[PDB]
Design a protein around this ligand. Structure first.
Ligand SMILES: C[C@H]1O[C@H](O[C@H]2[C@H](O)[C@@H](O)[C@@H](O[C@H]3[C@H](O)[C@@H](O)[C@H](O)O[C@@H]3CO)O[C@@H]2CO)[C@H](O)[C@@H](O)[C@@H]1N[C@H]1C=C(CO)[C@@H](O[C@H]2O[C@H](CO)[C@@H](O[C@H]3O[C@H](C)[C@@H](N[C@H]4C=C(CO)[C@@H](O)[C@H](O)[C@H]4O)[C@H](O)[C@H]3O)[C@H](O)[C@H]2O)[C@H](O)[C@H]1O
Ligand SMILES: C[C@H]1O[C@H](O[C@H]2[C@H](O)[C@@H](O)[C@@H](O[C@H]3[C@H](O)[C@@H](O)[C@H](O)O[C@@H]3CO)O[C@@H]2CO)[C@H](O)[C@@H](O)[C@@H]1N[C@H]1C=C(CO)[C@@H](O)[C@H](O)[C@H]1O
Ligand SMILES: C[C@H]1O[C@H](O[C@H]2[C@H](O)[C@@H](O)[C@@H](O[C@H]3[C@H](O)[C@@H](O)[C@H](O)O[C@@H]3CO)O[C@@H]2CO)[C@H](O)[C@@H](O)[C@@H]1N[C@H]1C=C(CO)[C@@H](O)[C@H](O)[C@H]1O
Ligand SMILES: OC[C@H]1O[C@H](O)[C@H](O)[C@@H](O)[C@@H]1O
Ligand SMILES: [Ca+2]
Ligand SMILES: [Cl-]
Length: 491
């Protein structure tokens, strides 16, 4: 469960949040394959509640109605088509598995669902599965409300309703088997693994029991005996009885400390500075690198405070670039849509807004002439600075963190063996200095400011001399105050 199952030399997943299956299929072929992306995390592919108040929120997809592969992203045919076309060009699909719960307990009965399935929350009736009253934790939960009230009580965190979401009885072999049936359907289609939603709200032993029932990966694309990559969503910043480490038996775990601390550093908040990143990773009290799934922001926390997002583009690019250059963890890049933010007493009252849509119909991802996206899709994964850093990570794969420099403040650099070097200026004055890069002598294209195309650079050029040294100059007023060069950006 710890191996991503990506093609050799492909080291990142991108979350194509709320993207339609047809758009993902095309993206694999036209972009992700040739740009060396490892895979795609997809929104939940299973039927959910169509919520009309407010209007089709992104979070409706986290309220299951059945395991029918029928959503605003598309149907089962489209989903199969996407996985096949993606695997055929060496790009993997990872499913957002919502298996802790069904929908909100107070949702109205009926067929207000993305595949028209009937369901009745009040009577605990989900006949498209089927689930019935016996398949939920109503009787196991010991809180007065039936919901989670206190995170300092590990038992209710697992046995009670997360914000009133009906809590599946994962201790029952029947419930485990219905979930495994769904996950096995996806595996056989060709899915390479799973993001396990709300992992904290499940007993590690119940997750294990479900995983024990899973097939090996599809033997047309994957070597014999391949297991799904598992990365479990557990938010653990400390201070709670449940720990990320409790889930290590099942696979990797999201390291939420990662983006929280890096954002704080890059914003220069709380007295933090980039020079402190010299011992980044386990030195910052993070989980072991071989279990961490890392990211600057995710679909939840990009809607809250302190986290860096595409809204803070300049600092965001640096943070994502630092992450992609650094060997700690397995990296996931966010890909978002814009929504009509509106702040009222410091809260975004429109943080619920679903993907770009015309009366609830998801808009296609259009591609502009300059390779950016239209229709309000942000496409961070297509931003030159990020896309090129995704390749940087591939090129330097397996090389050691080395040649660290800092000015004691916010001017830092480091290399990856003899294959890549990166330089950051986050201070309020100019970074002008000759540094040991660890690289062979040559002219290198800065892949942040530009591209190598045939035999020239479209941006900055760095000149590495015979002793591996090169001069860097980065103004503090630079639009992208960082430079990165690697073995494949050499002229
Ligand atoms: C979203 C996230 O929530 C949980 O995370 C906890 C975390 O475990 C805690 O440690 C802690 O963390 C804080 C920490 O304390 C801070 O100090 C630190 O700085 O920041 C962190 C936060 O980053 O708090 C957080 C937040 O509570 C889960 O542990 C985690 O798994 C969650 N992420 C997941 C899971 C889900 C669930 O599938 C997805 O959730 C999203 O979708 C749901 C469902 O649609 C949506 O909720 C909506 O629907 C509800 C039914 C509704 N409820 C109301 C109705 C009631 C009547 O029945 C009431 O009973 C109830 O109380 C009402 O609130 C919600 O209002 C409505 O919004 C979620 O909002 C949405 O996020 C995530 O996307 C997925 O990634
Ligand atoms: C282990 C520790 O890691 C992180 O701490 C960072 C600091 O946030 C950062 O400012 C910097 O701290 C000093 C640095 O170590 C030192 O070399 C430099 O000269 O001065 C810096 C402060 O001015 O670097 C450290 C990591 O080296 C996290 O932010 C911390 O939360 C984290 N602490 C841990 C460890 C313990 C055990 O004592 C608990 O207190 C806490 O629960 C846990 O999170
Ligand atoms: C492909 C493209 O990537 C990069 O562009 C990013 C910005 O760097 C990023 O900050 C963000 O810009 C938004 C900005 O923050 C805000 O002021 C404004 O309201 O909205 C902007 C988006 O419209 O997003 C864009 C991408 O959408 C580079 O900075 C661009 O130079 C880069 N274009 C290049 C690169 C290539 C090939 O690598 C060519 O295809 C393209 O023609 C060329 O212009
Ligand atoms: O209560 C558990 C039961 O849920 C309902 C189903 O018809 C049945 O298959 C299952 O045994
Ligand atoms: Ca639960
Ligand atoms: Cl996540």
């Amino acid at each position: 469960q710890y191996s991503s199952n990506t093609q050799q030399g492909r080291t990142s997943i991108v979350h194509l949040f709320e993207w339609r299956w047809v758009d993902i299929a095309l993206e694999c072929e036209r972009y992700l394959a040739p740009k060396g992306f490892g895979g795609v995390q997809v929104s939940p592919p299973n039927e959910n509640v169509a919520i009309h108040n407010p209007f089709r929120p992104w979070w409706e997809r986290y309220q299951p109605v059945s395991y029918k592969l029928c959503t605003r992203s598309g149907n089962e045919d489209e989903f199969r088509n996407m996985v096949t076309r993606c695997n055929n060009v060496g790009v993997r699909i990872y499913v957002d598995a919502v298996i802790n719960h069904m929908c909100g307990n107070a949702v109205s009965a009926g067929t207000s669902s993305t595949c028209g399935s009937y369901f009745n929350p009040g009577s605990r009736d989900f006949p498209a599965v089927p689930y019935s009253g016996w398949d939920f934790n109503d009787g196991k939960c010991k809180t007065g409300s039936g919901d989670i009230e206190n995170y300092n009580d590990a038992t209710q965190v697992r046995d009670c309703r997360l914000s009133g979401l009906l809590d599946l009885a994962l201790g029952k072999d029947y419930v485990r088997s219905k979930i495994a049936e769904y996950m096995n359907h996806l595996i056989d289609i060709g899915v390479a693994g799973f993001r396990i939603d709300a992992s904290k709200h499940m007993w590690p032993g119940d997750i294990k029991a479900i995983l024990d029932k899973l097939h090996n990966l599809n033997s047309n694309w994957f070597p014999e005996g391949s297991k799904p990559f598992i990365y479990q969503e557990v938010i653990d910043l400390g201070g709670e009885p449940i720990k990320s480490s409790d889930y290590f038996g099942n696979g990797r775990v999201t390291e939420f400390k990662y983006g929280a601390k890096l954002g704080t550093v890059i914003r220069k908040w709380n007295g933090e500075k980039m020079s402190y990143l010299k011992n980044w990773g386990e030195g910052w009290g993070f989980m072991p690198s071989d279990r961490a799934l890392v990211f600057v922001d995710n679909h939840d926390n990009q809607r809250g405070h302190s986290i860096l997002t595409f809204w803070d583009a300049r600092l965001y690019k640096m943070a994502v670039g630092f992450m992609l250059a650094h060997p700690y963890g397995f990296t996931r890049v966010m890909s978002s849509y814009r929504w009509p933010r509106y702040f009222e007493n410091g809260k975004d009252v429109n943080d619920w807004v679903g993907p770009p849509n015309d009366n609830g119909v998801t808009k296609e991802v259009t591609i502009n002439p300059d390779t950016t996206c239209g229709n309000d899709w942000v496409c961070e994964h297509r931003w030159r600075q990020i896309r090129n850093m995704v390749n940087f990570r591939n090129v330097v794969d397996g090389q050691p963190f080395t040649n660290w420099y800092d000015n004691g403040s916010n001017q830092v650099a480091f290399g990856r063996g003899n294959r890549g070097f990166i330089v950051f200026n986050n201070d309020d004055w100019t970074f002008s200095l000759t540094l040991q890069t660890g690289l062979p002598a040559g002219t290198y294209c800065d892949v942040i400011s530009g591209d190598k195309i045939n035999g020239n650079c479209t941006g900055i050029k760095i000149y590495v001399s015979d002793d591996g040294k090169a001069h860097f100059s980065i103004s503090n007023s630079a639009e992208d105050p960082f430079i990165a060069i690697h073995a494949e950006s050499k002229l």
